[PDB]
Amino acid sequence: QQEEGKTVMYTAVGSEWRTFGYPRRRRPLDSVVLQQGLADRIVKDIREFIDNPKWYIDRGIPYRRGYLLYGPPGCGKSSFITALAGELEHSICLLSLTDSSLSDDRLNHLLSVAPQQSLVLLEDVDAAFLSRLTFSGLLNALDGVASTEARIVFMTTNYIDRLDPALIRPGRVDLKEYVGYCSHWQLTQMFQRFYPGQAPSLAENFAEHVLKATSEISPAQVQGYFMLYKNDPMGAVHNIESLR
Amino acid sequence: VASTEARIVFMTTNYIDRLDPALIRPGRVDLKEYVGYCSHWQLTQMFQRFYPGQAPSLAENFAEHVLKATSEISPAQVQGYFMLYKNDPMGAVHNIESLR
Amino acid sequence: QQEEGKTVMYTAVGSEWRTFGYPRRRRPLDSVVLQQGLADRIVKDIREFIDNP
Amino acid sequence: PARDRSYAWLLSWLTRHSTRTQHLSVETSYLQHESGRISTKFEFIPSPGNHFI
Ligand SMILES: Nc1ncnc2c1ncn2[C@@H]1O[C@H](COP(=O)(O)OP(=O)(O)O)[C@@H](O)[C@H]1O
């Protein structure tokens, strides 16, 4: 009980995984609020996949699963990935495929030598697919059997139209989810999270005012606005009309 | 002769016509085998392996329907189709005609 | 009985064999179904070759 | 002797065969995996002295 869990980020240089930085504090899962039940669905799917390794080995199917998260930027995708990794006590292996330093063979080698009990995150997947750089080479390398036990891979991108349905298939990305802008439930959850204990009607009015003012409000913008009025709920509520 | 004790070597290829009979000889490839598409026995074995415990008649009907629909069905395609209807044998059986 | 066997893949770089990746779980033989008796024939031939040095 | 590997095997077999051993010692398997994952398990072993089976 005196030991605090930490999340370790693994960066890739050349054809090797390196421990970038120092162990980080694990962000609580409830801190990130995406939607009504998207977090629950993703957590349940991940728990089912992890807790049933006998199912995959007996049927001779690779113990590999992939997820895709597409939505507006700043919607809390990477934060949710970090929170999920902290909950599962895994480690994220962040890799930017948008860089031209790595090639298709280099990407396959890095993805095959990923540490055990570790997650791999490949952001900006649209850039490589749109175009060292390759579009089909990455998906060919993903389907390669060169991997380890329980290779969980997460896909995140701003838009999904640039990709193709061939990417989404068994043995590849399996459960894609769309993260959207804040809703009334999301806004009131954020308001009660930032300010520990207030009138729920006040939070509801705040959420309604924000929804009326803006239609495509992002959670990053909400957090930035909250930072302006830190430890000031009434002033923030009175200043909602200022945002317009 | 540059080898060690018990040097077992396996050859795999998509087609054999590109090679020559000189390759197949003692001191070389010895027991060549041809792997083919799924059969009725193979299909029912796969069905009972993926789903632990069902009616063998259901598996036989599934195999017959697959054989009628496709003549060159590959086991990889069968596994991929099973992944679509994971933990869903009745739906998979009803969706055999969908493959055509 | 508490030890689980593993299969190790050896890759080749330059003129040397290297241990690629980590030890993998051994896929059961019955999981792969090729034909009526091809697996049995191959297994029997391999066992005969190994067991008679 | 303790140097031989049959020591641990015999002790585990003893602690299994004689479930109700009033005198016993404890062996802890502790492994802190990367990313701060701690795995612990208590293996109980017969204590030094005399035992009857
Ligand atoms: N659901 C959320 N709950 C709390 N904070 C969020 C949420 N979504 C976004 N944020 C905040 O917005 C910022 C987004 O930064 P960034 O990681 O660049 O974008 P994204 O999180 O979309 O990958 C984070 O610092 C985070 O604090």
A181 Cα to the center of ligand 1, angstroms: 12
A75 is in an annotated binding site: yes
Span between the terminal Cα atoms of chain A, in Å:
47
Can you read off the two tokens belonging to residue D3? 């140097």
A93 is in an annotated binding site: no
The closest alpha carbon to A175, from A61, A18, A66, belongs to: A66
Q: Under a CB-based contact definition with an 8 Å cutoff, are residues C21 and C9 in contact?
A: yes
A147 Cα to the center of ligand 1, angstroms: 30
Resolution of this model in Å is 3.7
Residue B37's identity, in one-letter code, is Y
Q: Under a CB-based contact definition with an 8 Å cutoff, are residues C18 and C1 in contact?
A: no
The reply to whether residue A91 touches residue D33, judged by beta carbons under 8 angstroms, is: no
CA distance A72 to A159: 7
CA distance C32 to B49: 10
CA distance A47 to A90: 13
Chain A residues touching C20 at Cβ < 8 A: 112, 146
* Backbone region of residue A113 per phi and psi (left: phi > 0; alpha: psi in -120 to 50; beta: other values): alpha
Cβ contacts of B40 within 8 Å, gap of 6 or more: B60, B63, B64, B67
- In this structure, what is the dihedral angle of CA atoms A38, A39, A41, A43, given to the nearest 10 degrees? 160
Task: Indicate if ligand 1 lies below 6 Å from the C-beta of A32.
Answer: yes
Chain A residues touching D34 at Cβ < 8 A: 8, 91, 115, 117-118
> How big is chain A, counted in residues?
244
The reply to whether residue C41 touches residue B35, judged by beta carbons under 8 angstroms, is: no
Task: Indicate if ligand 1 lies below 6 Å from the C-beta of A75.
Answer: yes
DSSP assignment string, A52-99: -HHHHHHTT--SEEEEEEE-STTSSHHHHHHHHHHHHT-EEEEEETTS
Instruction: Give the number of other CB atoms < 10 A from CB of residue A224.
Output: 11
Element (H, E) at A104: helix A104-112
The reply to whether residue A171 touches residue B80, judged by beta carbons under 8 angstroms, is: yes
A116: nearest CB among C22, C31, C32: C22
- In a 10 Å sphere around its CB, with 0-12 CB exposed, 13-18 middle and 19+ buried, how is residue A37 labelled? exposed
Interface test with B, best of C9, C34, C50 (most B CBs within 10 A): C34
Mind telling me how many Å the CA of A113 is from chain D's nearest CA?
A: 15
Q: Under a CB-based contact definition with an 8 Å cutoff, are residues A162 and A129 in contact?
A: yes
The closest alpha carbon to A46, from A6, A13, A2, A86, belongs to: A86
Cβ contacts of A102 within 8 Å, gap of 6 or more: A12, A95, A110, A132
Work out the angle at residue A189's Cα, subtended by the Cα atoms of residues A194 and A119, and round it to the nearest 5 degrees.
Answer: 90
The reply to whether residue A170 touches residue B83, judged by beta carbons under 8 angstroms, is: yes
Task: Indicate if ligand 1 lies below 6 Å from the C-beta of A182.
Answer: no
A115 is in an annotated binding site: no
Element (H, E) at A20: strand A16-25
Q: What is the DSSP letter of D23?
A: S
CA distance B32 to B11: 9
CA distance B78 to B70: 11
Residue D33's identity, in one-letter code, is H
Q: Are strands A64-70 and A16-25 parallel, antiparallel or unpaired?
A: unpaired
Neighboring chains of A (3 or more beta-carbon pairs < 8 A): B, C, D
